[PDB]
Design a protein around this ligand. Sequence first.
Ligand code: ARG
Ligand code: NA
Ligand code: ZN
Length: 432
Amino acid sequence: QSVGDSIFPSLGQRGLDVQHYDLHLTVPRPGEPHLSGDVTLTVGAREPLSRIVLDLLGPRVSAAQWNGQRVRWVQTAQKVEVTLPRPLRPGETGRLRLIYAGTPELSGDPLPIRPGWQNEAGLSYSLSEPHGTRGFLPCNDHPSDPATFTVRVTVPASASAAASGLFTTQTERNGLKTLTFTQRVPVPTYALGLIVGPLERRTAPDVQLGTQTVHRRDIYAAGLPAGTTVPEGETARMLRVLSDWFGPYPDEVYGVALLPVRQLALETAGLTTMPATSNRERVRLHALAHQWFGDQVTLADWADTWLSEGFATYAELLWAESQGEDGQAMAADWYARLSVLPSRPLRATREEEIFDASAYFRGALALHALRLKVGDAAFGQFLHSYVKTFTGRPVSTTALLTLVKTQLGAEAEQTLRVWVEGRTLPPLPEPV
Ligand SMILES: NC(=[NH2+])NCCC[C@H](N)C(=O)O
Ligand code: NA
Ligand SMILES: [Zn+2]
C-alpha cells in the first residue's frame, strides 16, 4: 500500500526503505523539460515486500532489473510497480534498476508552488517540495524515507550542472559533459538539488566546526539581478552559530545556488536552491537551519511541517540574538502578525495548511514558550538531543512531546502542549 500520509495518502509505499539512489540523468537541452534517466535504487524493507512501488509522474520506463536479472514491471498513471521474483524481507537489500525517458510533470494544488522539475530561461532545476521529485526520478516520494544520492548529470558541453553532494569528476565525450556528485548523508527526495544550465561554481574557504570540516561552495547562474550576493564570511558565521545550537552540521559542504528566477528558496541538501528574489539574510539562515530540521530530521507525515518550518523559523531568532538583536522583541513581531490571522493546531489537517502562517510562526513561538519555560541551557541541550534522537528516524509531533516529557519534564511537555493543541493562539510567551 501507500505510506498512508494524512495529507497526501497516495504517495510512497508502506514498509519500503530506499537506502541509496544512483542516478544518471541526461538533459539534452537545459530549459526544456524532456530528459532521460538511468537509476539504480539500493532498497531495504521494514516489512516483507513482494513488489517495489515507486512514484513516477511523467517519464516512461523502458526497462527494469532486480539484482541484475530481468524483472516484471508495469507503469500506472502515477506509479511504477516492479514484481520481484521473491519478496524483499527486513534485513535484505536489493538493486532495482529503471531505465526511463520523457517529460516530467509538475504536481498540482493551486500549495505556494507546483513542485517538480522546473524549466525557465535556459535553466532546468528541481524545486520539488513536497512531492515533485517523482517527476524526474522514480522514487519513494515521502520524507519518511530519506536516502543517499549519487548523481551523474550529462549535459551539452556549453552548459554545466550542479547537484547536492560533493563534486567528484567531470568527463567530456562527443560534445557532452558528465558531472558526478555524491550526497553521502541521507536526505528526503525533495531535498535532492539538481540544476543544469549556465552555472559557475565558486569555492570559498573551508569552515572548521571543532573537529568537523565543512567545505564551502556556491553556484552562480547567469543573469542575476544587481545585488544578488552572498556576503563574505557570512555562511561561516551562520554555520558556527547554528551548529553550536543544534549540534554538528549534518553534511560535508554547504552553499547556495543563486538562480535568476522568481521563486521561493528550498533547502536542497548542502546546496540551497536560492532564487534571487528570495536571497535575504533571514532566508539564507532559514534554509541553512533546514539542513538539520527537514533534511537530517525528516517528517513522518506532511501534517507535521511545523517541525521543519517552525524550527527553521526559530533559528532566525537564534541567529538574530547571536548578532546582538533582541530576541524577545522579534518574537513579539511574530505574535503580532499571527494575532491578526487565524490559528490552528500545529498538526495540519489539509494541504493548504502545511505551509501556512501557523506552520512557521506558531511553530517557532511554540519553541519560544518551551525555551522560556526550561531555560536557555536546558533548551539548547534539548535541541542537541532532539537532533540526535531523530537522526535516522522520522519525527512526529507526538514523538516530540514524548521526548520533551522524557528530557525536560512533564511541566515543559504541558507548556508545549498549549501551543501544539488548541485552535486559538495562546498569549505571547514572555519570561516569567
Ligand atoms: N512558501 C512556501 N511554503 N514554500 C515551501 C517551503 C520552501 C522551503 N522549504 C522554505 O524553507 O521556505
Ligand atoms: Na531510506
Ligand atoms: Zn522553510
